[PDB]
């Protein structure tokens, strides 16, 4: 798995415009092999719209590096957060729909996302 494909497994869902039930994060955190991962975001936009962020607004990454990029547009995202009834073998998540700007770190000679940093 390249860093780009890890980013797509861990955060992309082009197959929906927005989380489809209060169980979306229970169905997807297990399904993309993240179960617990306390917090995670899926982005409901096409792969090309997410790759286009790597040539938009350059900002600092949380890890101190400086190749992160924040979307000019708000995007549909699902925020997945551990409830208070969730210890790992059975991991329960609160599904929350949001429209937000995203920040990703970008790499490669196809210059593409390899890390989801934040949303704002």
């Amino acid at each position: 798995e390249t860093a780009a494909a890890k980013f797509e497994r861990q955060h992309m869902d082009s197959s929906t415009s927005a989380a489809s039930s209060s169980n979306y994060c229970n169905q997807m955190m297990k399904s993309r092999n993240l179960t617990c991962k306390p917090v995670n975001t899926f982005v409901h936009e096409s792969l090309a719209d997410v790759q286009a962020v790597c040539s938009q607004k350059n900002v600092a990454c949380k890890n101190g590096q400086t190749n992160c990029y924040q979307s000019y547009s708000t995007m549909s995202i699902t925020d997945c957060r551990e409830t208070g009834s969730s210890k790992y073998p059975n991991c329960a998540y609160k599904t929350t729909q949001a429209n937000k700007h995203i920040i990703v770190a970008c790499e490669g000679n196809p210059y593409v996302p390899v890390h989801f940093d934040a949303s704002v």
Epitope: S55, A60, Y111
Partner: nanobody, 121 residues
Amino acid sequence: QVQMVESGGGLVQAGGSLRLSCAASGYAYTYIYMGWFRQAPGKEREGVAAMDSGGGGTLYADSVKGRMTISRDKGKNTVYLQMDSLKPEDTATYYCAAGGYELRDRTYGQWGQGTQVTVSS
């Protein structure tokens, strides 16, 4: 589209000086890192110098330390390479690059097309 504009390459005698200029044209914010890379035939692309948009974060490959100065206009998408005491081993294509981190070229996404620098003997 952002366009990397990039001038100053050419042909000088050993010990001579050149100055490379570069601007990211059409970008409305300020790229945090901009730096310079080079590549001789059949050889790895290697980092030469990088600098952040505040004048800080400066970095140099050891083979050019003492002989090339990078500089930028603070808060702007320009970067310059002043090359002094050039050697035959400095003969290479030199590329402008913007928007990445230090001399980690995989982190850079905007690249200029490169100008020849040749140093005769």
